[PDB]
Amino acid sequence: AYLAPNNLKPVVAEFYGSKEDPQTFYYAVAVVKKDSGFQMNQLRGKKSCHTGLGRSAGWNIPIGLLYCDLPEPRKPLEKAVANFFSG
Amino acid sequence: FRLYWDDLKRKLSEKLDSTDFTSTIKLLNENSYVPREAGSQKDENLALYVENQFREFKLSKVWRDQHFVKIQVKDSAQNSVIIVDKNGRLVYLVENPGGYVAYSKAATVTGKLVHANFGTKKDFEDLYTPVNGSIVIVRAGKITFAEKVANAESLNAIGVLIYMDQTKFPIVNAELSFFGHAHLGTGDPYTPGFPSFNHTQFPPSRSSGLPNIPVQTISRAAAEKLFGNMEGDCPSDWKTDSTCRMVTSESKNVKLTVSNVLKEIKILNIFGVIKGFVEPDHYVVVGAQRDAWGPGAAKSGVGTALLLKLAQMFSDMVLKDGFQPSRSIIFASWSAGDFGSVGATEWLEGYLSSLHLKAFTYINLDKAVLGTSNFKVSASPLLYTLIEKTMQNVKHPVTGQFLYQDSNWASKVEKLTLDNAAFPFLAYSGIPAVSFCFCEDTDYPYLGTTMDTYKELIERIPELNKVARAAAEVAGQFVIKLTHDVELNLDYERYNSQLLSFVRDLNQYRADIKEMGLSLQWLYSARGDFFRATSRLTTDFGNAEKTDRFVMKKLNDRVMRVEYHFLSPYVSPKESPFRHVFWGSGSHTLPALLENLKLRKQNNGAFNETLFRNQLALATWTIQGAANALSGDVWDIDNEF
Amino acid sequence: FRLYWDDLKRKLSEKLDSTDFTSTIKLLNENSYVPREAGSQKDENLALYVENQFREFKLSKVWRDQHFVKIQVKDSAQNSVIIVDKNGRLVYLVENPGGYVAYSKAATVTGKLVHANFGTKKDFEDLYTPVNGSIVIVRAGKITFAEKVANAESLNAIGVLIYMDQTKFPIVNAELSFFGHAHLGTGDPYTPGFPSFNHTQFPPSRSSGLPNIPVQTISRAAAEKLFGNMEGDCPSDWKTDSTCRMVTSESKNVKLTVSNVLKEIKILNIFGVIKGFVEPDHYVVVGAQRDAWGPGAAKSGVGTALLLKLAQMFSDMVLKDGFQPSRSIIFASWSAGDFGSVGATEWLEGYLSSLHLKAFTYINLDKAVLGTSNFKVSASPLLYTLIEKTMQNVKHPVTGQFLYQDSNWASKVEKLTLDNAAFPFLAYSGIPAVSFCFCEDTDYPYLGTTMDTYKELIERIPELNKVARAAAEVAGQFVIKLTHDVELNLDYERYNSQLLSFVRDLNQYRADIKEMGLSLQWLYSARGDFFRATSRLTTDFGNAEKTDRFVMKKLNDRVMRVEYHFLSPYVSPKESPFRHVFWGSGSHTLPALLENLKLRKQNNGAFNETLFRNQLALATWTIQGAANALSGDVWDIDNEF
Amino acid sequence: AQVPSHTVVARSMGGKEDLIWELLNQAQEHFGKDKSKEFQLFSSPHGKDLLFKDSAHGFLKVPPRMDAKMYLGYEYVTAIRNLREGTCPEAPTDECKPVKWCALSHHERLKCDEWSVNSVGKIECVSAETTEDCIAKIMNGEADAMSLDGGFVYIAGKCGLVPVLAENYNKSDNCEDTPEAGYFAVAVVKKSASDLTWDNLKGKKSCHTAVGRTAGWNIPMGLLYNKINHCRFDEFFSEGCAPGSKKDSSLCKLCMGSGLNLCEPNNKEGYYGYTGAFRCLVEKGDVAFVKHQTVPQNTGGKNPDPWAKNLNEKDYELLCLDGTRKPVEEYANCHLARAPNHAVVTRKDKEACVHKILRQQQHLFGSNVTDCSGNFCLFRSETKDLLFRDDTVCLAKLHDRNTYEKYLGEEYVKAVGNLRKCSTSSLLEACTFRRP
Numbered sequence A: 001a002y003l004a005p006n007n008l009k010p011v012v013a014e015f016y017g018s019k020e021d022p023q024t025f026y027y028a029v030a031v032v033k034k035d036s037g038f039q040m041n042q043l044r045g046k047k048s049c050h051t052g053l054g055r056s057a058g059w060n061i062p063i064g065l066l067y068c069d070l071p072e073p074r075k076p077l078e079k080a081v082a083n084f085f086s087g
Numbered sequence B, C: 001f002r003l004y005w006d007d008l009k010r011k012l013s014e015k016l017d018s019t020d021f022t023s024t025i026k027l028l029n030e031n032s033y034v035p036r037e038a039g040s041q042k043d044e045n046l047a048l049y050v051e052n053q054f055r056e057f058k059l060s061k062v063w064r065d066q067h068f069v070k071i072q073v074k075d076s077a078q079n080s081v082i083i084v085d086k087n088g089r090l091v092y093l094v095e096n097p098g099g100y101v102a103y104s105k106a107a108t109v110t111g112k113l114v115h116a117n118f119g120t121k122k123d124f125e126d127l128y129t130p131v132n133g134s135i136v137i138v139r140a141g142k143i144t145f146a147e148k149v150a151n152a153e154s155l156n157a158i159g160v161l162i163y164m165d166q167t168k169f170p171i172v173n174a175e176l177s178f179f180g181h182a183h184l185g186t187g188d189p190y191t192p193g194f195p196s197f198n199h200t201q202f203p204p205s206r207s208s209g210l211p212n213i214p215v216q217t218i219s220r221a222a223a224e225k226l227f228g229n230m231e232g233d234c235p236s237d238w239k240t241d242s243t244c245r246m247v248t249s250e251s252k253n254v255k256l257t258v259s260n261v262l263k264e265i266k267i268l269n270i271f272g273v274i275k276g277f278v279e280p281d282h283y284v285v286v287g288a289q290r291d292a293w294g295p296g297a298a299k300s301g302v303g304t305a306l307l308l309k310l311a312q313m314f315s316d317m318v319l320k321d322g323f324q325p326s327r328s329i330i331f332a333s334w335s336a337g338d339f340g341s342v343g344a345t346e347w348l349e350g351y352l353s354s355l356h357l358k359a360f361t362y363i364n365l366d367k368a369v370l371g372t373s374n375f376k377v378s379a380s381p382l383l384y385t386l387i388e389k390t391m392q393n394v395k396h397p398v399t400g401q402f403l404y405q406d407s408n409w410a411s412k413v414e415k416l417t418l419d420n421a422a423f424p425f426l427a428y429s430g431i432p433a434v435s436f437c438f439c440e441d442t443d444y445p446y447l448g449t450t451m452d453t454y455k456e457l458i459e460r461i462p463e464l465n466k467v468a469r470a471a472a473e474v475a476g477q478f479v480i481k482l483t484h485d486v487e488l489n490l491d492y493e494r495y496n497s498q499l500l501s502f503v504r505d506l507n508q509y510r511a512d513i514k515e516m517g518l519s520l521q522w523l524y525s526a527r528g529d530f531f532r533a534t535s536r537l538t539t540d541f542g543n544a545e546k547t548d549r550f551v552m553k554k555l556n557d558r559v560m561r562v563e564y565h566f567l568s569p570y571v572s573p574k575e576s577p578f579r580h581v582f583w584g585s586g587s588h589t590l591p592a593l594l595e596n597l598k599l600r601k602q603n604n605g606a607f608n609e610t611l612f613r614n615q616l617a618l619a620t621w622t623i624q625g626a627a628n629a630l631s632g633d634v635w636d637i638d639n640e641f
Numbered sequence D: 001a002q003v004p005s006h007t008v009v010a011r012s013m014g015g016k017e018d019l020i021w022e023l024l025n026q027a028q029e030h031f032g033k034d035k036s037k038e039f040q041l042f043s044s045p046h047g048k049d050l051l052f053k054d055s056a057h058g059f060l061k062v063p064p065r066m067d068a069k070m071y072l073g074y075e076y077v078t079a080i081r082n083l084r085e086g087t088c089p090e091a092p093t094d095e096c097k098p099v100k101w102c103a104l105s106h107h108e109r110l111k112c113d114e115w116s117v118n119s120v121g122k123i124e125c126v127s128a129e130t131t132e133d134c135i136a137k138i139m140n141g142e143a144d145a146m147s148l149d150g151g152f153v154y155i156a157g158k159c160g161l162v163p164v165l166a167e168n169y170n171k172s173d174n175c176e177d178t179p180e181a182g183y184f185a186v187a188v189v190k191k192s193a194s195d196l197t198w199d200n201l202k203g204k205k206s207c208h209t210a211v212g213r214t215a216g217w218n219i220p221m222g223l224l225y226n227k228i229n230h231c232r233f234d235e236f237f238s239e240g241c242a243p244g245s246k247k248d249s250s251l252c253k254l255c256m257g258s259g260l261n262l263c264e265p266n267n268k269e270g271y272y273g274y275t276g277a278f279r280c281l282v283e284k285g286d287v288a289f290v291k292h293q294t295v296p297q298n299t300g301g302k303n304p305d306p307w308a309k310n311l312n313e314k315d316y317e318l319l320c321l322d323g324t325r326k327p328v329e330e331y332a333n334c335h336l337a338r339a340p341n342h343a344v345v346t347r348k349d350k351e352a353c354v355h356k357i358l359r360q361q362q363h364l365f366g367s368n369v370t371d372c373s374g375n376f377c378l379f380r381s382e383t384k385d386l387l388f389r390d391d392t393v394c395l396a397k398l399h400d401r402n403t404y405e406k407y408l409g410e411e412y413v414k415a416v417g418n419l420r421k422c423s424t425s426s427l428l429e430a431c432t433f434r435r436p
């Protein structure tokens, strides 16, 4: 949103904890079905549910974590992630 | 299904695995095209063949151009060299030379003879005997012929003879004679700075670089018969034959007669284009030289063969395969590339208005294949990063490893020599250029002779096909890397090392600059401003959207004139044309300032203090001017306070 | 919402019936600003006042730019003009002139005095008395001072005395002095070509324009004492008074002494800018001179008044009202316009690499309001249609009529003279420039004078508020009409009538051109090529969408550089800076080619035939090259076949 | 991983931000968490996460100093930018890139660029106009190092930078090893006025180095704060020269930097720095707050600039905090407090590189080099104390102690912490926005 010709700035941020101790950060986690038999490193070719393209907790931390195990060509990212997950 | 860089590189390699260069080098060396003087009939048939092929590969526009140029050919009377005494009555004939130097003045003179090792400007001080009042001989190689005649003419000589020894140029035949042009500079000389079209009425004008002395080439056995009568011994620093000698005997004398007449010939240039889809008016030029004095198999056949095959691969790859280049591509075949390459220079000076900020790269496919040992590149420094990545993706044709073997090659690179066809583009027009050869450790021996034929070239280079395939791959890598993507690959930060090398070279003479009474520190600050300029521009390429086109056009127009702003705007283009403050000739460039300060430590009385202080003012404000022109606008400077 | 044109000129008139110029012209004539030579303290206080105002009006960015120049100022000793008898015994003096001439020489001489009309070259060749070795007198007006001294220097005279008669200049006070710069060319002469910043470290140099002869301005009543001693009648063709006489009597002879000293003073330029919303980096410069020698309300008062009120008006229309410009606007107050306009020329030579191809119009507000009757404009031809539309909107201040009375006005326009401040933008840089004045038929009497002040100004013009309202309205129409729209209103059709005028002027010498052996046809075809380029460009505006921006930027860039391509690329910008081939100075311009050609018929020997061949070749190829660069890409130039 | 919150974006120029905050601030009170039963802001019947999250509880203002890149941080901007461009760095540390130094206001650009050429090419220069902006420019990535005094070492310490090398002052044969304790802050008054006293400072003119610095602002006004008990200092003193403070104050309008450069915290003003505080002390002030070494460095023809050429030591005497007089020659028995020496700060990833390049770059251009005119001396300067403190001897190594908490010591962190509610520097507010 801030890359030109947009130039947009954040003006009001929102809080996630209780009213007593306001938290500003929030965690990103990966939820899976029980007894499905995957750890983080077998995570290949299995059908994955993302929340958006460029959203923080759903794209950048999952693809950034498993990112450098991908084969060449890395760019464009969606081609290699598209060949990485089986749909 | 769009195409990205990986698919397009393997698509290019699938094209290069199929083509056969060797049949086309054998086809540009058939008996119907083989002796190609400039403007002669045998040039014309090849020119219609190249225009016909460019129509046959379905290029988007094929167009040609013809204009009239003065060259200088042999008269019916035979120029010759001869040995006489003080009276002239003793007559012993040496020889009658077949080859001739174009643009040598027509005169007959006598005199004693003095040797020089190459005619370097360092040589005539290291020489023992005084040079003036006497004919010189020089040994062919390491500089252009025009610099030899310009140096020996600058020290009041009378004539220049040129020969090829056995150590530098090992050839079996001791009879072979050769050729070279003597214009210091480039282009048709009798129209300096304006085009040779017949719109320009052909006014009487004469270039300021033409010589005044008769220059002649002799063979090797013709040189040794002069070495029999001359008495002396060469220094052992000159790696040479055993038979060289310095000066003549005292009763002896050498007269040479030179008779060459001007002729007015017709010059062709043959062009084709591939249109672009995003920006059609911005284009990249790829050239080649079409004629050469001998048969010309190493000098013109390989360049034209590589040009025709790149036309086949790129027009085939745009039409059938589905490639979409964002910028246009101009294929060019220059003629009279051998008299200082007058085709290219008259083409720029014809169409300099239409090429202003439009063209942004030349690639020189001339003399690409000369051997198989090294890889020698020479380019304007915006292409260096580009060449980096290309040298990581081209395998050497003999050994399977890559060409980027030495991690520090940007300092080994020499600047563009004046006989190279890219030097009028970079030095004269401010367009980034590149040339490249697969040069052997020793240079190709019979280059401009009559011995340059095909079967000698296949005996010297045993696998011509894989080497020509590697050079065609490097040129294809360049053309795709510039014209596939929204971002230009001209790396602009590479000029920072060049400015740092200049100021670091002047920082040793700071001790005398403080003696004149003027400080250096404004030029330190000018280098600083160019660094913050390219840093701010790298930030602006950071914070932009890549998908959007209207902002990336505004940035690419700001990168595309980072070379135009180094052309010095205080000198006439008609008088001293090569206006590039780094890389060009004159009294305005930066080596001329380093030289003109370096003279003062000699305390000779030869340096010129007013010319120095003037040079420092103009060079300082030129560097600071380019730094202001990069960083933004008029109001974002960041001026004095 | 949006604001269209007819809403917006209405909003300008509603902002314009409120402002008051009269109080500001009183403010620039108070006792805290009134004598302001360049570099004086009052100049710097006025520059702090203006640079405060540009902050208070909420401009987007306000910036200062200073540099050091060399002017010439009076010495502590007087300079006099003093009659010397032949005896050498009794010595009589005429005046100690309060006013001086800039850039003259410090000298003292005696000799005969000879009247000349205005110092036209026609006058000096019409004279009967030989000119050489004798001081001259001329009348001010119709020519710059520097060309009077230039002609009197070419005819080998020693001294020049300049005065104001009553017929051309009707005033009451006969004892009045004035001022003028004598430098032919413009800019700071001790740094020609390169700017006068503190990075150049001021190398030794000198311009070509500086005369070597003393110049002095004398009053009318001083001229009556000199005309009391002379004899030989003025001829009746000189529309003059009844007192002027031709040469001195043989007894007496005058003595001119002029003693002036150089000085190095600090120059301030104040700027402020309003940003754009579609394309911020292209801009349009509006200027005014900030100082004058005497009290100076006609020269620099009305310019700074119009400038401050316009900056208030457009900053108020953008901030409060909702006007949205598409391109930036730079408002500018430079000093030292009186020494041949060095405050602007040193800026153009300063930042030429950054406003290459960016600044597309300069407007001059200087000397706007002098007379109340007429309306005179002088401009580049690209702006003519623009001015025509403005003359169909603005009403006259005195009568209710419009300005567009004469429907045939494009021929009465005279080219920009060198004492105008818009001349280095057009002729040196290549920016289309426009100046205008409400001027009475005879020029304004006390314009460089100690009596130029607001009292006598409001005596001449009894309604100054309405006329200043009209001139600010015209400059408002120019800025708004240039800036609100996606299409520039530069009319490139207009150079075509100039070219037809030139080739038609050469047809009457086709008889002499045919005798030399060279034809004229290629120059006709050059005119035709420029016609088809402009017609093709107009049709390409016919087929373009208007809301689209990427296909209107590519058609606006071709319009912006139709002015730059008429600058000659074949001359050095230090040796002769004004390179516009139409409107320039030197041997390269087109009336210089005509003025070379007509001298062949008289057969003196002054014609230079080789020079004429080079001028025909270079003029033909410059016009033909602009005609190539206006129409399409490279491949769409049609050749001679 | 942890990520920053969702934000309401808006324009950068037109805004309008105060109507967004004015709207939502009156919205979360009445409508936040069961505050109205009729309408819910953070829940919906026909969907979830509409216009806001259903996990949000409140809205606070983004400070006006914080732009986009400082909002996301540096680690997260670098991760998203590398994920777009596709680089995946290997990074073994063999050769290091040239360090992009940061310098302010066109004198430090001169000395910095001369140092850029006299090096091989290892030190580059990027400018700024305040020190507070150059700290942000380190946090973005457009510069790497800086030399800051301890008050701005506290600010850049809060923001996430670390100190690497710490300037010494005491001459020794081994000073790269030795950890110096620090330097003493004093206030300097004259022999013309003998009525002045630390207990009697009401309505007197007070010259300062600049806002945020140790000896000029933090140490004296932290001690004056516990007596005067209120945050405003423009009402305690009558006048005084302190640059960088707000343009309205009397503290702004005593200074001299003309024109429009009044209270600009850099070498545009004459009165900026230690020596410029001594200039307003000599010219127009009553008391100045400087280091103890200021009066010896401007006494007795050490400065060739004439106003300090004429002056003398004995007339100027420094005042204790109880109310007595003790001489400038004897500074140890009378000082305001012991403030730590200045320090070079950089990001946590380029710590080893700036350590290595400045250690090597020190020995070439240090205090060993004589004949400074006609050569380069990095630690000397043209008496304006630019890019480095002029009486540095060597850049001391920091081992076991590289954190603003550990380096600044407990008494100074407490001494700034007693003033933290009075601080008005916007970048400190934006850096302390991060903390829950």
Ligand SMILES: *[C@@H]1O[C@H](CO)[C@@H](O[C@@H]2O[C@H](CO)[C@@H](O)[C@H](O)[C@H]2NC(C)=O)[C@H](O)[C@H]1NC(C)=O
Binding pocket: B068, B198, B264, B265, B266
């Ligand atoms: C343009 O110039 C060329 C070269 O000057 C002209 O060609 C010459 O024409 C004359 C007259 O017919 C011949 O005697 C010469 O032999 C021609 N030169 C050559 C090299 O063949 C040409 O006629 C000119 N005009 C046009 C329209 O092309």
Ligand SMILES: *[C@@H]1O[C@H](CO)[C@@H](O[C@@H]2O[C@H](CO)[C@@H](O)[C@H](O)[C@H]2NC(C)=O)[C@H](O)[C@H]1NC(C)=O
Binding pocket: B608, B609, B610, B611
């Ligand atoms: C040194 O430079 C000066 C400055 O160019 C030369 O002096 C003059 O240069 C002008 C060109 O502007 C020419 O007319 C002549 O070359 C010189 N004119 C004179 C001496 O009246 C000078 O020639 C240069 N060389 C030397 C050896 O001094």
Ligand SMILES: *[C@@H]1O[C@H](CO)[C@@H](O[C@@H]2O[C@H](CO)[C@@H](O)[C@H](O)[C@H]2NC(C)=O)[C@H](O)[C@H]1NC(C)=O
Binding pocket: C068, C198, C264
């Ligand atoms: C810019 O150049 C000017 C011209 O020399 C310098 O101004 C002079 O400086 C000297 C010494 O400081 C003094 O005579 C005056 O201050 C100035 N002389 C005149 C006649 O004005 C100026 O110092 C230069 N600027 C810089 C930054 O060095």
Ligand SMILES: *[C@@H]1O[C@H](CO)[C@@H](O[C@@H]2O[C@H](CO)[C@@H](O)[C@H](O)[C@H]2NC(C)=O)[C@H](O)[C@H]1NC(C)=O
Binding pocket: C608, C610, C611
């Ligand atoms: C007429 O034009 C000719 C053009 O050749 C001038 O002659 C020479 O012009 C060059 C310019 O490059 C000068 O360097 C030479 O010194 C000139 N030679 C002579 C003898 O003048 C010539 O000056 C021009 N004017 C006249 C009156 O003939």
Ligand SMILES: *[C@@H]1O[C@H](CO)[C@@H](O)[C@H](O)[C@H]1NC(C)=O
Binding pocket: B130, B132, B133
């Ligand atoms: C040039 O040659 C002549 C004889 O060859 C000689 O006398 C003269 O000294 C030479 N010139 C110089 C500068 O040595």
Ligand SMILES: *[C@@H]1O[C@H](CO)[C@@H](O)[C@H](O)[C@H]1NC(C)=O
Binding pocket: C130, C132, C133
């Ligand atoms: C120049 O002036 C002198 C004055 O004594 C005169 O005699 C001479 O004739 C003049 N020159 C010419 C060429 O007329």
Ligand SMILES: *[C@@H]1O[C@H](CO)[C@@H](O)[C@H](O)[C@H]1NC(C)=O
Binding pocket: D363, D364, D368, D369
């Ligand atoms: C100071 O410089 C000299 C010479 O460059 C060098 O030998 C010496 O080691 C340096 N001093 C220190 C403390 O490194």
Ligand SMILES: [Ca+2]
Binding pocket: B187, B188, B191, B192, B193, B194, B195, B196, B345, B346, B349
């Ligand atoms: Ca030419």
Ligand SMILES: [Ca+2]
Binding pocket: C187, C188, C191, C192, C193, C194, C195, C196, C345, C346, C349
């Ligand atoms: Ca100048």
Ligand SMILES: [Fe+3]
Binding pocket: A055, A056, A057, D006
């Ligand atoms: Fe989220």
Ligand SMILES: [Fe+3]
Binding pocket: D149, D150, D213, D214, D215, D342
């Ligand atoms: Fe400090």
